[PDB]
Symmetry: C2
Subunit: 209 residues, 2 copies
Amino acid sequence: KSVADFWFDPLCPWCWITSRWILEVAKVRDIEVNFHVMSLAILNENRDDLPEQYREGMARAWGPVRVAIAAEQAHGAKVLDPLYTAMGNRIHNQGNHELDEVITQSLADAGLPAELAKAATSDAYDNALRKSHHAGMDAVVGTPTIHVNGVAFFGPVLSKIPRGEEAGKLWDASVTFASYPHFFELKRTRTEPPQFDKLAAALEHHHHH
Amino acid sequence: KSVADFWFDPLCPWCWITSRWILEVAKVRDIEVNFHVMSLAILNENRDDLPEQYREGMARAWGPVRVAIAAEQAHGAKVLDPLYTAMGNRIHNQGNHELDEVITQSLADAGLPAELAKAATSDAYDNALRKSHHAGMDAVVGTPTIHVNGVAFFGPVLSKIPRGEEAGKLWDASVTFASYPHFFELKRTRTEPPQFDKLAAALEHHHHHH
Ligand SMILES: [Mg+2]
């Protein structure tokens, strides 16, 4: 069947929305979904891209992606879906940028060993991380990046998560564009920020009471 | 029905490919197609990084668009489809940049009065051209721009004219993206120059000369 390969950094709000879209697509279309890790920190490693004043901030971004790579190595790519969902729910839906806590709680959420958190304070996963990152990002700029049946695109840039059959129609459309080698761009000007679907998280908080 | 509003300058190769695409769509889908004039010269005027020598060159790109606007004012928007087809066939499919020949012959092909060619040597139509241009281009960057069911996009950027059912599927896809107001971009690096339909050009040449 058709295949979506999707590269994510847990910190990226655009990856978050587009990945939730893919997951919606897989509920209404028969597709294979493979997640792969990429790194905003790698995109921002050079001072010509991110001034030194910000590096103390961006250095925190290595932790979650190192942990994701470590999790995938030990437990298989199958764990990336639940681990990413957990990290993204805390980062985007709950607004948590305390990434030590996000890592610890997300590993727990995904039923994984707590020891994986130690990957954040290691470079042992960085070669694997860089290989994964470049496989996704080189082929097309920034996030979000998807391959639709082996064809790499930047986007779709979505500011809200499409659901159900609407999500499925957007996938059908993407597959058509991917199937035409002489199509390169469809774009309109964006002036609105990402909007997350925070209702479930709010209901979860309420029901824990 | 679904509607394509398409803005074109006869000199633009990307407008040519995308407009030919839409005409292919119309063969395999029920669609309303409306053409409107825009101007590469106006695009260039409004840049702040264009050297003077190129501004002088762009000052020579007003002819075909002025004539198109004049033709529309006199005979209605309905004339833009046949007039543009005639101009573009010559400019792009035949590589003819003798714009006086192109304008004269294209007015004739479209059954329009020869005197419309005089619009090229006037500024009387320039405000109308600016209004038309901005209506198309501002709503979205440059060409090609299309409005799909009222929604303005840059693109689809196509380097080759899609034909047959493939043209139709690409339209279906565009309509779906247009229908979701929180979609903004799908892109890959352009690695192809514009490709015109050389077969069509040669068959036309054959049909009319042989
Ligand atoms: Mg009009």
